[PDB]
C-alpha cells in the first residue's frame, strides 16, 4: 500500500509540472542544515544540504510548510525547500540537543531539583535584528558596479559610461539597462516600520528623503520580471556595506585603479582641477579596500577596456546561461 | 651587492607604472568619444 505514491508522484510531476512555466519571486536559502539526515518535505523532498549563497525561487504555492527552490544553474534542480518561517523552525529543535541547553543549571543536576529550559531562550526574542532568513528577490540578480572614485566626477563621467558601452550593443535580450539616480542608503532588509505612504500627517519621514529612494525595487519589478539586470549610476553607489546587504543582494564588479600610484597619476588626466574631489579621491580607494573588502568577485582590473571586456563579459554570460 | 638595496625595484616599478597608463588614458579618451 502506498497512498503517498499516488500523490507524491503527482506532486513530483506538479513541482516542475510544465517546466516552461516561468519561475516566480525568488526565495533564497541562507541557513545551512542537513537536508538528507531526516526524511521530510512532503514529496520526500530529497534536496541537498541547505546553505547560503544558493539563490532559489518559489513558484509552487502548495503548502506554506515547505517551498520549492530554483538555484541559479541550467535546469534549476527542484526540491521541497523550507519556508522562510519554517527554516528558522527547523533550526529551532536542535537548541536542547546538547544536554538540555539554555537557562538550566545542567552542572551535576542529577538529583532533587531539576532544570528544564523554559520557553524563554528560543525565538521568542531578538526583535531588533528580526529578519526573514530567506530573501525574496527577483530575476537574475542584477550586478552592481563599484570603483574607487566619486560617481559624477571627471574620471567617472567619461569612463563610468564605458563600463557597459559594449554591453548596450553586445549584451541585450538577456540583459537590459535602466539608468537611475537615487539615494539607496536608508534601508537594507527592514528598518522602518512606517515606510513611505503619506505626506499629510506632518511626519518627519516625509520631511526627509523617503519614497523614491524606498520603492526602487517596486518599480524596477517591471524590468526585474523581464529577466534582465539593472545598470544604474547615482551619487550613493561608491563603497561596500549598505548595498552589500540592501534590498538587492549585490554582485559587485570592481573597476579598480589597482596600484594607488596610478590612481593619483591618472587623477590628473586633462591637466588639473581635481578640486571637486582630491582628498576623498585618494581615500576613495582607502574607504573600500584597506579594510578587507570581502567582495568584488569580478575584478574589472587591467590596463585594457578590451581585456576588462572579457573579464566582465565572461562571468555574466555564464551566469546568465543558467536561466535557460 | 647592489641588488640588495632594491635599485632594480625602482625600474621594475617604473615599467608597469608606465605600461598601465596608456590603456588607462585611451580607455578614458575613447569613452568621451561615445557621447552621452
Amino acid at each position: 500500500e502506498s497512498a503517498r505514491r499516488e500523490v507524491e508522484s503527482q506532486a513530483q510531476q506538479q513541482l516542475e509540472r510544465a517546466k516552461h512555466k516561468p519561475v516566480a519571486f525568488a526565495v533564497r536559502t541562507n541557513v545551512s542544515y542537513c537536508g538528507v539526515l531526516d526524511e521530510e518535505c512532503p514529496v520526500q523532498g530529497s534536496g541537498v544540504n541547505f546553505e547560503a549563497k544558493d539563490f532559489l525561487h518559489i513558484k509552487e504555492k502548495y503548502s506554506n510548510d515547505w517551498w520549492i527552490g530554483r538555484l541559479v544553474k541550467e535546469g534549476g534542480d527542484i526540491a521541497f525547500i523550507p519556508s522562510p518561517q519554517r527554516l528558522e523552525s527547523i533550526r529551532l529543535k536542535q537548541e536542547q540537543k546538547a544536554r538540555r541547553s539554555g537557562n538550566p543549571s545542567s552542572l551535576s543536576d542529577i538529583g532533587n531539583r531539576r532544570s528544564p529550559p523554559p520557553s524563554l531562550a528560543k525565538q521568542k526574542q531578538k526583535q531588533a535584528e528580526h529578519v526573514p532568513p530567506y530573501d525574496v528577490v527577483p530575476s537574475m540578480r542584477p550586478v552592481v558596479l563599484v570603483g574607487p572614485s566619486l560617481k559624477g566626477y571627471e574620471v567617472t563621467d567619461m569612463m563610468q559610461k564605458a563600463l557597459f558601452d559594449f554591453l548596450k550593443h553586445r549584451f541585450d535580450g538577456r540583459i537590459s539597462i535602466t539608468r537611475v539616480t537615487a539615494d539607496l542608503s536608508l534601508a537594507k532588509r527592514s528598518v522602518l516600520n512606517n515606510p513611505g505612504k503619506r505626506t499629510i500627517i506632518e511626519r518627519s519621514s516625509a520631511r526627509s528623503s523617503i519614497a523614491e529612494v524606498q520603492s526602487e525595487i517596486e518599480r524596477i519589478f517591471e524590468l526585474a520580471k523581464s529577466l534582465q539586470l539593472v545598470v544604474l549610476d547615482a551619487d550613493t553607489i561608491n563603497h561596500p556595506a549598505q548595498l552589500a546587504k540592501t534590498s538587492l543582494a549585490p554582485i559587485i564588479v570592481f573597476v579598480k585603479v589597482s596600484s594607488p600610484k596610478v590612481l593619483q597619476r591618472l587623477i590628473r588626466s586633462r591637466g588639473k582641477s581635481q578640486m571637486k574631489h582630491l582628498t576623498v579621491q585618494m581615500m576613495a580607494y582607502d574607504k573600500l579596500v584597506q579594510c578587507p573588502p570581502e567582495s568584488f568577485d569580478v575584478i574589472l582590473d587591467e590596463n585594457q577596456l578590451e581585456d576588462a571586456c572579457e573579464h566582465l563579459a565572461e562571468y555574466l554570460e555564464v551566469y546568465w546561461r543558467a536561466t535557460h | 651587492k647592489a641588488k640588495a638595496r632594491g635599485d632594480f625595484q625602482k625600474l621594475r616599478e617604473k615599467q608597469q607604472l608606465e605600461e598601465d597608463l596608456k590603456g588607462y588614458l585611451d580607455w578614458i579618451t575613447q569613452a568621451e568619444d561615445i557621447d552621452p
Binding site: 565572461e314 562571468y315 555564464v318 | 632594480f8 625600474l11 621594475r12 615599467q15 608597469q16
Partner: peptide, 26 residues
C-alpha cells in the same frame, strides 16, 4: 638588468592571464 627584468616580469604574465580559468574552472 634587462634579462632579469624580462624573466621576472614576463613570468607573472602566465600566473595572471592563465588564471582566467582559475576563477571559472574552480
Amino acid at each position: 638588468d634587462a634579462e632579469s627584468l624580462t624573466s621576472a616580469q614576463k613570468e607573472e604574465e602566465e600566473e595572471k592571464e592563465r588564471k582566467k580559468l582559475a576563477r571559472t574552472a574552480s
